[PDB]
Amino acid sequence: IEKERDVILQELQENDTSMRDVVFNYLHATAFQGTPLAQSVEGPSENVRKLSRADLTEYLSRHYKAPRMVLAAAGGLEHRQLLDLAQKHFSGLSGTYDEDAVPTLSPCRFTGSQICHREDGLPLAHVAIAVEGPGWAHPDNVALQVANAIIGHYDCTYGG
Protein backbone atom coordinates (compact mmCIF):
# COMPACT_ATOMS: atom_id res chain seq x y z
CA ILE A 1 0.00 0.00 0.00
CA GLU A 2 2.77 2.42 0.84
CA LYS A 3 5.18 1.13 -1.79
CA GLU A 4 2.66 1.60 -4.58
CA ARG A 5 1.42 4.87 -3.10
CA ASP A 6 4.98 6.16 -3.18
CA VAL A 7 5.51 4.57 -6.58
CA ILE A 8 2.26 6.16 -7.68
CA LEU A 9 3.07 9.51 -6.09
CA GLN A 10 6.31 9.11 -8.00
CA GLU A 11 4.35 8.51 -11.19
CA LEU A 12 1.60 11.07 -10.61
CA GLN A 13 4.21 13.79 -10.40
CA GLU A 14 6.13 12.27 -13.32
CA ASN A 15 3.04 11.95 -15.51
CA ASP A 16 3.22 15.73 -16.07
CA THR A 17 5.92 15.16 -18.69
CA SER A 18 3.77 14.39 -21.78
CA MET A 19 1.53 17.27 -22.78
CA ARG A 20 -0.51 14.74 -24.71
CA ASP A 21 -1.93 12.75 -21.81
CA VAL A 22 -2.15 16.10 -20.07
CA VAL A 23 -4.58 17.81 -22.38
CA PHE A 24 -7.12 14.97 -22.59
CA ASN A 25 -8.47 15.00 -19.07
CA TYR A 26 -9.11 18.72 -19.33
CA LEU A 27 -11.42 17.99 -22.21
CA HIS A 28 -13.47 15.45 -20.26
CA ALA A 29 -13.93 17.81 -17.31
CA THR A 30 -14.77 20.45 -19.86
CA ALA A 31 -18.08 18.95 -21.01
CA PHE A 32 -18.49 16.03 -18.64
CA GLN A 33 -18.22 18.05 -15.47
CA GLY A 34 -21.08 16.98 -13.26
CA THR A 35 -20.65 13.25 -13.89
CA PRO A 36 -17.90 10.85 -12.80
CA LEU A 37 -17.13 10.23 -16.47
CA ALA A 38 -14.85 13.25 -16.68
CA GLN A 39 -12.69 12.40 -13.67
CA SER A 40 -9.11 11.19 -13.76
CA VAL A 41 -8.45 7.50 -13.98
CA GLU A 42 -5.76 7.95 -11.37
CA GLY A 43 -7.78 10.50 -9.43
CA PRO A 44 -6.60 13.14 -6.98
CA SER A 45 -3.11 12.90 -5.52
CA GLU A 46 -4.69 13.05 -2.09
CA ASN A 47 -6.79 9.86 -2.14
CA VAL A 48 -3.56 8.23 -3.32
CA ARG A 49 -2.40 8.96 0.21
CA LYS A 50 -5.84 8.66 1.77
CA LEU A 51 -6.88 5.18 0.67
CA SER A 52 -7.52 2.28 3.02
CA ARG A 53 -7.82 -1.16 1.50
CA ALA A 54 -11.28 -1.45 3.02
CA ASP A 55 -12.66 0.66 0.16
CA LEU A 56 -10.58 -1.54 -2.11
CA THR A 57 -12.12 -4.73 -0.78
CA GLU A 58 -15.43 -2.87 -0.81
CA TYR A 59 -14.93 -1.86 -4.41
CA LEU A 60 -13.43 -5.29 -4.94
CA SER A 61 -16.66 -6.50 -3.41
CA ARG A 62 -19.25 -4.64 -5.44
CA HIS A 63 -18.20 -4.59 -9.05
CA TYR A 64 -16.32 -7.88 -9.54
CA LYS A 65 -19.35 -10.13 -9.52
CA ALA A 66 -20.88 -11.04 -12.86
CA PRO A 67 -22.46 -9.86 -15.32
CA ARG A 68 -19.66 -7.38 -14.85
CA MET A 69 -17.22 -10.19 -15.56
CA VAL A 70 -16.52 -11.22 -19.15
CA LEU A 71 -14.16 -14.03 -20.18
CA ALA A 72 -12.69 -15.08 -23.50
CA ALA A 73 -9.49 -16.27 -25.20
CA ALA A 74 -8.22 -16.98 -28.69
CA GLY A 75 -5.62 -19.22 -30.27
CA GLY A 76 -5.54 -22.80 -31.46
CA LEU A 77 -8.30 -23.49 -28.94
CA GLU A 78 -11.69 -24.21 -30.30
CA HIS A 79 -14.47 -24.15 -27.73
CA ARG A 80 -15.23 -27.48 -26.08
CA GLN A 81 -11.70 -28.18 -24.93
CA LEU A 82 -11.98 -24.74 -23.38
CA LEU A 83 -15.39 -25.25 -21.80
CA ASP A 84 -14.31 -28.44 -20.02
CA LEU A 85 -11.34 -26.67 -18.46
CA ALA A 86 -13.38 -23.52 -18.08
CA GLN A 87 -15.41 -24.99 -15.68
CA LYS A 88 -15.25 -25.02 -11.94
CA HIS A 89 -13.84 -22.05 -10.18
CA PHE A 90 -15.32 -19.66 -11.84
CA SER A 91 -18.22 -21.84 -12.56
CA GLY A 92 -18.28 -20.52 -9.96
CA LEU A 93 -16.62 -18.66 -7.10
CA SER A 94 -19.25 -16.04 -7.73
CA GLY A 95 -18.41 -13.80 -9.30
CA THR A 96 -22.03 -13.57 -8.41
CA TYR A 97 -25.04 -11.77 -9.64
CA ASP A 98 -27.21 -10.31 -6.89
CA GLU A 99 -27.73 -6.58 -7.23
CA ASP A 100 -24.91 -4.14 -6.35
CA ALA A 101 -27.38 -1.64 -7.82
CA VAL A 102 -27.96 -1.98 -11.61
CA PRO A 103 -26.00 -1.42 -13.78
CA THR A 104 -25.46 1.83 -12.42
CA LEU A 105 -24.67 4.46 -15.03
CA SER A 106 -26.18 7.83 -15.87
CA PRO A 107 -26.40 10.17 -18.88
CA CYS A 108 -23.35 12.39 -18.71
CA ARG A 109 -23.61 16.10 -19.27
CA PHE A 110 -22.33 17.56 -22.53
CA THR A 111 -21.15 21.08 -21.89
CA GLY A 112 -20.14 23.70 -24.43
CA SER A 113 -17.23 25.46 -22.74
CA GLN A 114 -13.49 26.07 -22.84
CA ILE A 115 -10.36 25.38 -20.87
CA CYS A 116 -7.17 27.43 -21.18
CA HIS A 117 -3.93 26.88 -19.27
CA ARG A 118 -1.52 29.49 -20.59
CA GLU A 119 2.16 28.73 -20.15
CA ASP A 120 4.81 30.38 -22.32
CA GLY A 121 7.88 28.26 -21.63
CA LEU A 122 7.47 25.25 -23.89
CA PRO A 123 8.06 25.32 -27.66
CA LEU A 124 4.68 24.05 -28.83
CA ALA A 125 1.06 23.86 -27.77
CA HIS A 126 -0.88 20.65 -28.04
CA VAL A 127 -4.35 21.62 -29.14
CA ALA A 128 -7.30 19.40 -29.99
CA ILE A 129 -11.00 20.10 -30.44
CA ALA A 130 -14.13 18.02 -29.99
CA VAL A 131 -17.91 17.71 -29.89
CA GLU A 132 -19.99 15.00 -28.24
CA GLY A 133 -21.34 12.05 -30.19
CA PRO A 134 -23.53 8.96 -30.12
CA GLY A 135 -23.17 5.86 -27.97
CA TRP A 136 -21.43 2.60 -28.80
CA ALA A 137 -24.30 0.82 -30.46
CA HIS A 138 -25.97 2.79 -33.21
CA PRO A 139 -25.99 2.81 -37.02
CA ASP A 140 -24.39 6.24 -36.97
CA ASN A 141 -21.49 4.57 -35.18
CA VAL A 142 -20.63 3.28 -38.64
CA ALA A 143 -20.81 6.50 -40.66
CA LEU A 144 -18.51 8.29 -38.27
CA GLN A 145 -15.79 5.76 -39.00
CA VAL A 146 -15.63 6.97 -42.59
CA ALA A 147 -16.12 10.57 -41.50
CA ASN A 148 -12.57 10.73 -40.13
CA ALA A 149 -11.38 8.62 -43.04
CA ILE A 150 -12.03 11.72 -45.12
CA ILE A 151 -9.72 14.23 -43.44
CA GLY A 152 -6.67 12.03 -43.20
CA HIS A 153 -3.84 13.21 -41.00
CA TYR A 154 -0.40 14.78 -41.37
CA ASP A 155 2.73 14.86 -39.21
CA CYS A 156 6.31 16.00 -39.67
CA THR A 157 8.08 12.91 -40.96
CA TYR A 158 5.42 11.32 -43.13
CA GLY A 159 6.71 10.83 -46.64
CA GLY A 160 3.56 12.62 -47.73
Binding site: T111, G112, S113, Q114, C116, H117, R118, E119, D120, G121
Partner: protein, 81 residues
Protein backbone atom coordinates in the same frame (compact mmCIF):
# COMPACT_ATOMS: atom_id res chain seq x y z
CA UNK B 1 5.25 41.31 -34.38
CA UNK B 2 2.02 39.48 -35.11
CA UNK B 3 -0.06 41.39 -32.69
CA UNK B 4 -0.96 38.61 -30.28
CA UNK B 5 1.98 36.25 -30.61
CA UNK B 6 4.84 38.33 -29.27
CA UNK B 7 2.88 40.43 -26.76
CA UNK B 8 4.38 39.28 -23.49
CA UNK B 9 5.47 36.20 -21.59
CA UNK B 10 3.01 34.69 -19.12
CA UNK B 11 3.19 31.54 -17.05
CA UNK B 12 0.77 29.25 -15.26
CA UNK B 13 -2.53 31.08 -15.55
CA UNK B 14 -5.67 29.02 -16.10
CA UNK B 15 -9.06 30.08 -17.46
CA UNK B 16 -12.53 28.54 -17.17
CA UNK B 17 -15.59 29.40 -19.26
CA UNK B 18 -18.77 28.06 -20.85
CA UNK B 19 -20.74 28.37 -24.02
CA UNK B 20 -23.09 31.38 -23.78
CA UNK B 21 -25.99 29.00 -24.33
CA UNK B 22 -25.05 27.21 -21.12
CA UNK B 23 -26.30 30.18 -19.12
CA UNK B 24 -28.79 33.05 -19.16
CA UNK B 25 -28.70 36.75 -19.93
CA UNK B 26 -30.23 37.51 -16.52
CA UNK B 27 -28.51 35.43 -13.83
CA UNK B 28 -30.27 37.19 -10.98
CA UNK B 29 -29.72 40.52 -12.69
CA UNK B 30 -32.12 42.42 -10.43
CA UNK B 31 -31.38 40.62 -7.19
CA UNK B 32 -27.61 40.55 -7.44
CA UNK B 33 -26.91 43.86 -9.14
CA UNK B 34 -29.22 46.23 -7.28
CA UNK B 35 -27.00 46.27 -4.16
CA UNK B 36 -23.95 47.06 -6.28
CA UNK B 37 -25.56 50.41 -7.08
CA UNK B 38 -24.62 51.75 -3.69
CA UNK B 39 -20.97 50.78 -3.37
CA UNK B 40 -20.24 52.68 -6.56
CA UNK B 41 -22.84 55.39 -6.03
CA UNK B 42 -21.50 55.93 -2.52
CA UNK B 43 -17.86 55.62 -3.59
CA UNK B 44 -17.41 58.83 -5.58
CA UNK B 45 -20.38 60.77 -4.21
CA UNK B 46 -18.19 61.62 -1.25
CA UNK B 47 -15.70 63.18 -3.62
CA UNK B 48 -17.81 64.87 -6.28
CA UNK B 49 -21.24 66.35 -5.52
CA UNK B 50 -20.48 69.07 -2.94
CA UNK B 51 -18.76 71.52 -5.31
CA UNK B 52 -21.91 71.73 -7.41
CA UNK B 53 -24.05 72.51 -4.39
CA UNK B 54 -21.92 75.59 -3.81
CA UNK B 55 -22.56 76.57 -7.42
CA UNK B 56 -26.32 76.14 -7.10
CA UNK B 57 -26.33 78.51 -4.16
CA UNK B 58 -24.35 81.09 -6.12
CA UNK B 59 -26.90 80.62 -8.86
CA UNK B 60 -29.71 81.75 -6.60
CA UNK B 61 -27.39 83.79 -4.40
CA UNK B 62 -26.14 86.15 -7.07
CA UNK B 63 -29.44 86.22 -8.91
CA UNK B 64 -31.12 87.38 -5.73
CA UNK B 65 -28.10 89.60 -5.19
CA UNK B 66 -28.62 90.84 -8.71
CA UNK B 67 -32.36 91.16 -8.40
CA UNK B 68 -32.68 93.87 -5.78
CA UNK B 69 -29.74 95.76 -7.24
CA UNK B 70 -31.90 96.82 -10.16
CA UNK B 71 -35.42 95.62 -9.72
CA UNK B 72 -36.44 98.21 -7.13
CA UNK B 73 -35.26 101.77 -7.61
CA UNK B 74 -37.37 103.14 -4.71
CA UNK B 75 -35.23 100.95 -2.48
CA UNK B 76 -31.96 102.63 -1.53
CA UNK B 77 -33.44 105.95 -2.56
CA UNK B 78 -37.13 105.61 -2.30
CA UNK B 79 -39.02 107.79 -4.74
CA UNK B 80 -38.61 110.56 -2.20
CA UNK B 81 -35.76 112.47 -3.79
Amino acid sequence: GRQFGHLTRVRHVITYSLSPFEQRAFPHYFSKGIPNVLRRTRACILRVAPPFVAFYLVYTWGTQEFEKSKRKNPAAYENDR
